[PDB]
Design a binder for this molecule. Structure first.
Ligand SMILES: Nc1ccn([C@H]2C[C@H](O)[C@@H](COP(=O)(O)OP(=O)(O)OP(=O)(O)O)O2)c(=O)n1
Ligand SMILES: Nc1ccn([C@H]2C[C@H](O)[C@@H](COP(=O)(O)OP(=O)(O)OP(=O)(O)O)O2)c(=O)n1
Ligand SMILES: Nc1ccn([C@H]2C[C@H](O)[C@@H](COP(=O)(O)OP(=O)(O)OP(=O)(O)O)O2)c(=O)n1
Ligand SMILES: Nc1ccn([C@H]2C[C@H](O)[C@@H](COP(=O)(O)OP(=O)(O)OP(=O)(O)O)O2)c(=O)n1
Ligand SMILES: [Zn+2]
Ligand SMILES: [Zn+2]
Ligand SMILES: [Zn+2]
Ligand SMILES: [Zn+2]
Ligand SMILES: [Zn+2]
Ligand SMILES: [Zn+2]
Ligand SMILES: [Zn+2]
Ligand SMILES: [Zn+2]
Lengths: 393, 393, 393, 393
């Protein structure tokens, strides 16, 4: 199966964070040592870069920041002063809108000057997807737990709606306006063909993949996460889409599973996500630093259990707990969103970590295979469980 | 005086952690930069490795883990994924008991496959003790504050009882069964003599040392820690034995002192120690990085006070506070267990650190020497003091 | 404009910390990677070094400690055990007073022995000031916001009073007594001229600068910080003087701004500052790692706005929040002291960081320049504001 | 078998380097990353420290230097300027003889002052040997290739001669004289019992071991290395003793083999070894970073060839070539001294490395075991071979 790249994952996550349910809004992904340490969105008061500064301080040192729009000079100077390594940005209309004029152009010039005189590398890191990536994402999106649950109780029309909305929000349809933006933000190297058309096509492909993933957890009928107090359904869908986007980084050759751990702070926060802050993320993969041939990749179809992937595969929730950027606070409401039903090996870890709520798929609940089972999720006590289903009330 | 090795200290501490008062139970010592950063025991729900993962996350990177039993494949894959440097284990029956069959053998095979394809080094690191180590430990154990206090108000009989119990728990008396276990867990290099007999003798010697140290703080008559609410006497004895085992790492040539700082969390935890979590450890030694001849080692017998050890020796409590892996929470109950009465330059440090309770011996209480005194412990206010004594009730 | 050096800033800050409003009292500055991570004062129970040990633990590794007095052997051994890099001290009467005898001399000998056999470098790092530095500091202090506010509603007389008091507290007027102290504390290389006279003159110049800066925020008439509950006026003045001292590290060629963030803990603390602990510090400067010609240094007088400093200069509050050594706890009272009224791009950052109180001089409040404005401080909601002012009561 | 420690090996090698065939003469061992990178001796013009400076330059950074005598102030200042980590010295009469007066005392005072004000750690690092190290060394020395070859064609009498000579050269028999030396060189912590007597006994034990090893390759009955031009027999014996001392660092449990590679430069050199300079050293051991139980330690007595040490043991010559500090220059004469006959997997490596001459023992020449053979040494062409033997003329 095709694998989404780390940088394209971070770009997609930054654009999706710009869509977190609450000068243009900006989503930001803070990555350290190729691990996500922050998911932020611009609020009405502060930009994503300012919020990242407030949240991280000097911990932004040697960090990679992925912005859904090019940050303003005020954000860029603070981010550079904090000591980050790379600032990758989505080359649409920047944070200070160029489609609104002289002040925005002056801000762009100041951003260029800051970039030219800093050790931080400000760049556009989005790369083309493989030829089959979009088709594979669509195939797995129609077949995921949530779409299957709705079907057993529409997807392409919602996907078309998401395509239109996200192409409006993230793309510059007018080629001349996009060329003007790219010239203003110092991307003259991408203003002439075939680089201009290649960049626009790559942006369109990434927007298509994002729309596919977002519609894989659709706002359809009364379907939501139900069955101690549930989150607003929009935020639950957004976090599930985050985990679903992570599921495409899987090293498993058959099934991709993603997991995001979020927590709700007691007090007010400066972030655009409100009291909710990102805690951890993960996908199912073999232990860090493993080559392709290091561990068996076969499923139960292989006769010898010793050469099956199950004893060696790290699950999405296990990776999310392992590489968490925040501690699970017992007094806070903490939620883990998993695209697949947590297995009997992961549920005790979630319970022991103190995670209060699990938002999960429901397809594999009750399955009992030789090396993996799903019996402890149905009978789990002390942790609230929310599954994709029709609203009982 | 003979000095206990760091690796043997960690092995003994993992074996003792397996005995913390509440698939076989497993103790675990997490060490970072040759400093202990975690003491864990398997609970009824989670193994020691899973608990260490939950408690540390990616902070296990480049850490040394010391297991009382060889971890299972599920624990090993998560520990390796976290990036640990070195997993040492006690070569008795592993976590998945081989003395119960096919599932345990398959788990051992998966553990060996994980070891072969990972940068983490899975090994048996226990070393032979010096010829005089056990005799010296026995001599100092009979002469310690607690045994002397009981005598001033039995030790060898309790020593024999602990020897029998710990040889039952930690050793495989049958040589053929031990050979089978070693072959299963991939220790064929130690299955034939003299390496098999050397390994068994080293294990027996370490178990004898552990029984000696555990008997030095015996469950005898109604003796316990008494004089705001005291811990259960079993946990207090266990922590005092931890500090006593640390006391044998001393650089002082005459008296070894050990100290352990523990804290009781307000909320429930996943660990087998309950709400109690390890905060810090220390022993009396010269400042880190000092050579043998760097500082004077003499005592008050030396005429010149300028060439006495007192002004240059770091006390056990000072080292426990310095290299603590956790912050002292003001709202939490925090306990420091010291094998000797805290001195007048340590009591203010304990009080200022916020440690609520001091469990200690009381032989030197009131002693006033030129370079060390014990006057501030008797008159200490704001910190609960628990000494080894008969129950006043 | 002349710039205060980092080592002189830290020496001055340690001397000022010794004067924090409540064996001689000692101030201590803990610096890591040329950033201040701790401001401590000796309490009645514990010395500054012991308090730094309690507060930081192993985080003192590779840290530079700046003491207002030479630490005692008990403090020095624990500090070098913690692994610090440099211990700079003010070469006046040490912590164990030599002007009071045999015990102090023995402590000094033990300190020298600890210094000889440790990798930590114990030294005197104070360096001569720039020739114009004192005159420039006097000129800017007379023209600072607080002195000007008093004038619009004395400074040299208060400066003379501070000169006398601080020369009494920090200098040894008798040359032979100072020579005895220097010989005892192992500074024989500075006991003969011109090095002895040069050291005494450097100390006098630094004391003069400290008196000037402390008089810039005088205890005059009923002037204090007023406008949810304010701090004691002495502590507010002390923190404002800290910020004023930081303002002389500015990279801006016209105006120096300093900011200190402190927090009042809920529970008792071992520090001499009481429940208050240092959170962060900063001054107005260009992004870290910038050369002199990297960014424009001009002001609004320059015609082109693209070559003005404003879009590239990091403000004092921005730097204080960026390089904070502590997290802003929502339940704690947090105060930021800034020598100039916070600008319109700093007030939202202070509000979003959770800082409860802003202490500031408000000369520029209401000013609206092209690239910087002060409109949001006057209308700021949710943050208590205290300005230099006559007491309204 | 007992294992000589790294630091005691380096101390013994520095003492032996002082005896290299040609203010007291000083031998010096330069070690980097626990590997020997230099063997130097004082010449008539330059001291060992000055020669090390000339030879290494800034490569002395973070190096450990082992001196047979405490270096003078001129040597010490240059060595600490070069940035070394540790200077361990043998605590006999220092480089500037204290047994000759005021100038030597002034030099010692300057050395102490340099040590006190430098991050380099000047110390005495010699450790006590295990209680049976000397007996094992004597047993293996009587049974070595050279002594056995002498017997098949005395040892204890030569051993007594070496004991007397080396106790005269390296020890201070007069206890009061040694106390005076130790006080002068700032070792007052080792001037009173039991530390004084312990240090003297440790020095005596190390001298006894050195005499044993040196007599294991004795100057006896015109025996030497014979069979294109051989070295002077004294230098060949000295290098063979170097390799023999390295042979006691072996990880093999039965047979210890050592190897030293030296090269004769074409031009004049400042070293006391003349044109000869140290190239590399090694002993037979398992691959670097291996635990005791990592690899099989068994020999041909074990039935299964897969669990024998031979396929996993790195030979002495292989380690000497691997961790060489100098390149083998084709135009220079190169000599490898190995305490055992080179095996069939070592001779091709020596030939391919360009080593011109092999000085070796010859007891195993012609032996052909299953996993190790000695057939290629007898028929080796293009490399001169010198064996312990009667002089043919
Ligand atoms: N809570 C879980 C459960 C599973 N996984 C990952 C790791 C598992 O190796 C993979 C599932 O692999 P299977 O071969 O069992 O896949 P399916 O469940 O899709 O298989 P099937 O439908 O054939 O039963 O998903 C995960 O990350 N988190
Ligand atoms: N609270 C304490 C007290 C002491 N120590 C350590 C450091 C001291 O140097 C050592 C005790 O050394 P003494 O020479 O004082 O030994 P004793 O306690 O045995 O004294 P005495 O000979 O009077 O019985 O123990 C410690 O770590 N913590
Ligand atoms: N809250 C603030 C406000 C300003 N500054 C810094 C930014 C600039 O480096 C400098 C102010 O520059 P100006 O040119 O505005 O200086 P003045 O205040 O002296 O301006 P004016 O000439 O109008 O009096 O102070 C700061 O650090 N924090
Ligand atoms: N040129 C060589 C030859 C051998 N060795 C080392 C590694 C070998 O593992 C060890 C020899 O191991 P054996 O068991 O073969 O020892 P002996 O040769 O002494 O055995 P025996 O006398 O029983 O034949 O010496 C070495 O370093 N360099
Ligand atoms: Zn911005
Ligand atoms: Zn799972
Ligand atoms: Zn396990
Ligand atoms: Zn003490
Ligand atoms: Zn002190
Ligand atoms: Zn500002
Ligand atoms: Zn010299
Ligand atoms: Zn060989």
């Amino acid at each position: 199966i095709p694998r989404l790249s780390k940088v394209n994952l971070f770009t997609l996550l930054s654009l999706w964070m710009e869509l977190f349910p609450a000068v243009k809004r900006t989503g930001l992904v803070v990555v350290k040592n190729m691990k996500i340490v922050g998911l932020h969105c611009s609020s009405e008061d502060l930009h994503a870069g300012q919020i990242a500064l407030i949240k991280h301080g000097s911990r932004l040192k040697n960090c990679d920041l992925y912005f859904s729009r090019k940050p303003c000079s005020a954000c860029l100077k603070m981010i550079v002063n904090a000591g980050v390594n790379r600032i990758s940005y989505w080359p649409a209309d920047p944070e200070i809108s160029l489609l609104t004029s002289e002040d925005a152009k002056l801000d762009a010039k100041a951003v260029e000057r800051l970039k030219s005189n800093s050790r931080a590398h400000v760049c556009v890191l989005l790369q083309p997807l493989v030829c089959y990536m979009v088709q594979f994402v669509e195939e797995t999106s129609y077949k995921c737990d949530f779409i299957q649950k709705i079907t057993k109780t529409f997807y392409y029309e919602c996907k078309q709606e998401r395509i239109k909305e996200y192409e409006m929000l993230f793309l510059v349809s007018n080629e001349e306006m996009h060329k003007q933006i790219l010239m203003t933000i110092g991307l003259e190297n991408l203003c002439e063909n075939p680089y201009f058309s290649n960049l626009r096509q790559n942006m369109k492909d990434l927007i298509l993949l994002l729309a596919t993933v977002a519609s894989s957890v659709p706002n359809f009928k009364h379907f939501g996460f139900y069955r101690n107090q549930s989150l607003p359904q929009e935020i639950a869908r957004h976090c599930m889409v985050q985990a679903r986007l992570l599921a495409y980084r899987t090293e498993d050759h058959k099934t991709g599973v993603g997991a995001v751990i979020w927590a709700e702070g007691k007090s007010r926060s400066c972030d655009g996500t409100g009291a909710m802050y990102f805690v951890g993320c993960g996908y199912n993969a073999f232990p860090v630093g493993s080559e392709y041939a290091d561990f068996p990749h076969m499923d139960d179809k292989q006769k010898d259990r010793e050469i099956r992937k199950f004893r060696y595969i790290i699950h999405a929730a296990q990776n999310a707990l392992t590489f968490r950027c925040q501690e699970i606070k017992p007094e806070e409401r903490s939620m883990i969103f998993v695209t697949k039903c947590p297995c009997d090996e992961c549920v005790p870890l979630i319970k022991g970590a103190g995670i209060k709520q699990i938002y999960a798929g429901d397809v594999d609940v009750g399955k009992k295979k030789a090396d993996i089972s799903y019996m402890r999720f149905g009978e789990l006590e002390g942790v609230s469980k929310f599954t994709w289903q029709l609203n009982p009330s």
